[PDB]
Design a protein around this ligand. Structure first.
Ligand SMILES: Nc1ncnc2c1ncn2[C@@H]1O[C@H](COP(=O)(O)OP(=O)(O)O)[C@@H](O)[C@H]1O
Ligand SMILES: Nc1ncnc2c1ncn2[C@@H]1O[C@H](COP(=O)(O)OP(=O)(O)O)[C@@H](O)[C@H]1O
Ligand SMILES: Nc1ncnc2c1ncn2[C@@H]1O[C@H](COP(=O)(O)OP(=O)(O)O)[C@@H](O)[C@H]1O
Ligand SMILES: [Mg+2]
Ligand SMILES: [Mg+2]
Ligand SMILES: [Mg+2]
Lengths: 526, 526, 526
């Protein structure tokens, strides 16, 4: 309630630090190839198992409200990093703890934690600069499989399947991931404009092999309203029999006398028509039919909303497609012709929508997969023998996917944690304005060493020996903690996307340096 | 979120292992011929009695949340096995515990439990290979009765009755199991298309013995809409009296003037018609009536899309059936004529439908029972003197049924637990990549011995003596724990379907090897 | 007996390790020049402040009986180290924790912790060997002041004053330490055989300057009984006036007519006698008079067994001393003649006495100072403005004293912690018999780095960076943590006695390696 309780200084700082340290200690066991999993109790079902830092971090709230404040801030950093990049979460967590501890310890009476924060931010800017300098953009699609396999915790089959899918769909094409029933992974590739609606009548079937309606060089008619008996349908058929092409009709429904005309002209004078229901869900179907309209080139009849009526059609009011296949369950349209400019406009609209949409009514992606399917889309059906396994593997696959996209879009840099280690000399050539800022730069200078020593510590080895051996060693070499020895990093394939290394550090330092500024904490009473 | 509490390392591992060990210890007493039952309190009724591993596992949740985590994972194993195979449950449980214990014990600081998991999974693949090598596909229907009787815990009458039903319905036909009212088991066989709806009026009755309407060489009319209509019924009767054959009419209802015409023409000019309500209800009736349509050859009237109206019928638009019997409660149609291609097509559709997501798609099985082999379904009415007896017995019968199907569809292999024991040499010829994987292969190597040693331990004998005596002995011989001595296994009838032995091991290792990877556990506070 | 409760495996190991880690964490803040003090509540008085590892360790018992078991064992190592060497205590604790942690972590199912102990002990033998190779025996008395000053936490005045006392009393002479009343330190040196008893009569005084009785080349008479004379004194006076030497008389008392004869012969015909009461009291006084007997030569009169009577004295039954000074409060005897063999036998007797006997009846040391005063003894009156200051400082002085003695008697080796670091290559050339022993040697190999990394960590610097920089650097150079930079170690004065470095490690590894062998813990119920 309204009643509250407050705490002052290094005592409260030590409590919040206890919370930070607890959550970080829980998260940090997952890090690297020799990292380990964390089980989390689920309220309704069987427990989650995960190696994902952020999903561990969000799962931990604390009874002690101050420790819970620390915990909430650390899961804030891990969540921000997962949102902005999709990997690098554990790294962001251990970094955030390091900045928070090294920050808290250096505070005194004469010290000015805000200015120290300023120094830290100077140092992180200076670091990401040198990171971008270090970045070398991806070229060979072997590097893709490397980034994927490393982000998937050494599963080569994952990074292989991601590499081939990314080849067959394109580096900025659509790849999505979902559960299999198969015990193994599967790559499915869809081409066209597929949606889960089938012919209204069996009588439309043409091949008898598969029981499909198969057409080529066809037109498409798009109706936002039902087409019942009105014979607003017939001109669309006269115009169709005119140009001797097959016709597909997509509508809210097609029934009454209209359908009877359709399967009479189909069954008696082998006319080539098929009719299918609009993909259909209330207001969503309008957006879908407008999508298929824009893709296939042409316009939707019926509206709210303006109105083009079905009685007055012209050949430029239809749609035009290279091929079409329909079954009892689903309809696929292929090589539809329209303005590519306008379709890229449409995709640019839906992506810019999706990005600002706050809402997990994810059909907006279901839209985006469709109109982008004229390049292709890949479905990643993940296997395994049990649901918890499937959720683990899928977490890792999604991580590797986001990592590969970050790699192609920004760059790749050394793995292990070496990429941050090499940035220390850039800090050595800084010019601090005052003691506080110098403390900040020192904090970052120590903090950069952390991820690599942590990956080594999880391996069971003397991590800080390994860090210093790496620093003494040349720029191209680092520590392979899985193989347990030093190697050329890029040659052995140990590499991290630059975007993730950037975002982990920037977010972690960003919230932790603010945390270190605290002098008074105010919390609700139990 | 909710306040939480976390635990680190071998302490938490020891707690989860306490839970696993408790649940496994409860489940494992049921194993084998000398196994024993477990009573489970029911909230509302008299207590359950069972020998089923999975039903034991599902019944046990634990107050200690960590132990409950272990327990939940083990019941996940037993449930996955029961879903995927239907018998191998106790085995999957004891296997899962063995992998979990032997896993947990071998972890240290330098160890890499993920890599150990990889080694374990390697070992399971290598084992299942040799299992498939060992598999000999079923041939004689004596072997059917053998797998059934062993899966039914030695009840010969069960495997006899299952053998009879499977003979008289076919190896991939439909057998179902239900309560008797009789003190003994009964095999009933239904032929045709039975459903639980009766004549609307008594006046339709023809036999006076049984009070049935009995027809042969009859026509059938299928209406999705009600027929209360004035004379939208009549042409359908004129066409029937024309070809002098009996007519059955199935509709949402027949109730208005139509019915009056029906029983006037019935009572005054003894025409052979009966009318019955559609099987019901709602959207289900559509699928059922289309099923009976497709089976009897012909089409459904009323609204689908293309509407065929009741006023315009033709003889090829009805249905044609070898025989029909109807009473007050149920209607059976027999030897209906239609394209067998189209009906097998339909069954192929419903099985691929039902594939997702039975909870609860129970009526999809009620459809498949109707539309599958219009010459072939079996009901297994199990007897006994009390409900608890009936339920235990029915659990065993369902187990034996699933076992017989797994045997017919994949194969049979040695019983006792010997089939897994013989796979050990295949592990002996493996080539582990590192120490961790070697630990994994060792874990599986120890774990394979468990089921046989457990079946012997339940017998009251020195199970691990028996295991080693078996291993020293030849491939064809194993331990008959009921008879208390060694015998040729296949000759004496002790055999297990390969599918269950495969799935138990695969699921158990699949979840337990993941469990062993845990380093931190996070649970809700009480 | 008492109801009890037992715990199994890594759970109990983690509990005991929690206790160890708590106590070690408390002790370890004291380490090195930048180390810090620990306040301990006293039950009766004002709280202790200390930098002494062992005194911190002894103060911490724990409510949780298992954690208390760990704590008890760690204070056991620290106490053993303090007893056997007198410094190196914090070091023994941090080593013990390192061996205990690294030990516990490496345990698994296949592991054999006793054999691991064997490997650890092998490693400790091998390291102390190389330590003895590194040792260079002390030479210049500058090195003394260096060892003292470093062991006194950088107080140069302490090591100066210790150097002075050790010069003027000898390297194996007696130095003792006690509270000053002065605000500054004082070195007092006593020569002779001093004790706190004065002339019975003022009339004995001869010098009038100071009011002392001063004699040279004198005789001494020792009587265990009172002398209220039967004129058992007169032959002893005739024998003294005969050989014209002064006579000092030490007795239980000098009384009655004896004293009258004494100060009559004193005030008249100026005879040179003095008489003083025995040092006292009771049975202690017997041992003291026999001590002075053996030192000054001659024999003690009165009843022991064989009774030597005062009536029959001979000059070889008296005693012979170079000088004597007595005042109202105390008596000092100087350059007493007797068998030096017999004197060293006597001190060797008293040390072997005190060493086995433990009532804090400290007079056995008061004996040792007396009979060893003919080399000399130094009292170290420590100053300060408050009792707590005096006690902390005195702790440090006693530490430096014991350290200087260990340095003189065994040797000196590199400070910082470098001396243990340089021994790692000696471990690198070992030949382990099996995996367990190899684990042990690895444990010691990691543990050797600890003291230096801890001294650096207390400084606020990246200790494990510093360790590796030191290892990369030459043998003669290490890290001056007070000055905050690398230096030649021996040149800068940072050096540790070899005995303490040996004993800390030997004790710590000795108990901790045994601790790691535990599988079951048994404790009393609260
Ligand atoms: N075989 C390996 N050797 C050395 N470093 C590795 C290896 N595999 C992965 N890494 C490093 O470990 C990190 C992977 O962290 P991860 O466990 O995925 O947590 P996050 O979710 O924070 O990425 C990367 O920075 C990568 O460079
Ligand atoms: N008489 C017997 N001798 C030896 N083994 C037997 C005998 N009867 C059954 N078994 C074995 O016991 C196992 C049956 O386990 P069961 O108790 O049904 O539990 P589950 O639910 O795992 O099937 C089979 O693997 C079978 O080989
Ligand atoms: N200026 C210095 N530089 C490096 N090491 C130092 C310095 N002064 C002291 N030490 C180290 O500190 C250790 C003594 O720590 P101390 O606090 O006395 O603990 P302990 O009671 O275990 O001796 C010695 O090993 C010595 O080498
Ligand atoms: Mg990752
Ligand atoms: Mg069974
Ligand atoms: Mg010391």
């Amino acid at each position: 309630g309204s009643a509250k309780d407050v705490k002052f200084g290094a005592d409260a700082r030590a409590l919040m630090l206890q919370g930070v340290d607890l959550l970080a200690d829980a998260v940090a066991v997952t890090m690297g190839p020799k990292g380990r999993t964390v089980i989390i109790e689920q309220s309704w079902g069987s427990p989650k198992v995960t190696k994902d830092g952020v999903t561990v971090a969000k799962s931990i709230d604390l009874k002690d409200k101050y420790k819970n404040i620390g915990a909430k801030l650390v899961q804030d950093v891990a969540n921000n990093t997962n949102e902005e990049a999709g990997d690098g979460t554990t790294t962001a967590t251990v970094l955030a703890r390091s900045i928070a501890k090294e920050g808290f310890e250096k505070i005194s009476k004469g010290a000015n934690p805000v200015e120290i924060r300023r120094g830290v931010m100077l140092a992180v800017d200076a670091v990401i600069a040198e990171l971008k300098k270090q970045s070398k953009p991806v070229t060979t699609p072997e590097e893709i499989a490397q980034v994927a396999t490393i982000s998937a915790n050494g599963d080569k089959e994952i990074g292989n399947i991601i590499s081939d899918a990314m080849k067959k769909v394109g580096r900025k094409g659509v790849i999505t991931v979902k559960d299999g029933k198969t015990l193994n992974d599967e790559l499915e590739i869809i081409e066209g404009m597929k949606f889960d609606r089938g012919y209204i009548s069996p009588y439309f079937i043409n091949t008898s092999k598969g029981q499909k309606c198969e057409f080529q060089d066809a037109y498409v008619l798009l109706s936002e309203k039902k087409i019942s008996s009105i014979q607003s349908i017939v001109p669309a058929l006269e115009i169709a029999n005119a140009h001797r092409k097959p016709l597909v009709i997509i509508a809210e429904d097609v029934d009454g006398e209209a359908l009877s005309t359709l399967v009479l002209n189909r069954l008696k004078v082998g006319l080539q028509v098929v009719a299918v229901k609009a993909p259909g869900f209330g207001d969503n179907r309008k957006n879908q039919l407008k999508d298929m309209a824009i893709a296939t080139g042409g316009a939707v009849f019926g509206e709210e909303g303006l109105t083009l009526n079905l009685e007055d059609v012209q050949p430029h009011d239809l749609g035009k497609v290279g091929k079409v296949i329909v079954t009892k369950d689903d309809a696929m349209l292929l090589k539809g012709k329209g303005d590519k400019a306008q379709i890229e406009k449409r995709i640019q609209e839906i992506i810019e929508q999706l990005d600002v949409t706050t809402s997990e009514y994810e059909k907006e992606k279901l839209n985006e997969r469709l109109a982008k399917l004229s390049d292709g889309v890949a479905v990643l059906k993940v296997g395994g023998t049990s649901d918890v396994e499937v959720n683990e593997k899928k977490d890792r696959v999604t991580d590797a996917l986001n990592a590969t996209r970050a790699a192609v879009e920004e760059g790749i840099v050394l793995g292990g944690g070496c990429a941050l280690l090499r940035c220390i000399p850039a800090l050595d050539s800084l010019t601090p304005a005052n003691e506080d800022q110098k403390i900040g730069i020192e904090i970052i200078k120590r903090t950069l060493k952390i991820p690599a020593m942590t990956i080594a510590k999880n391996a069971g080895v003397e991590g800080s020996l390994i860090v210093e051996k790496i620093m003494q060693s040349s720029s191209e070499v680092g520590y392979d903690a899985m193989a347990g020895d030093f190697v050329n990093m890029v040659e052995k394939g140990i590499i991290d996307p630059t975007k993730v290394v950037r975002t982990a550090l920037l977010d972690a330092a960003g919230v932790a340096s603010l945390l270190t500024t605290a002098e008074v904490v105010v919390t609700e009473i139990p």
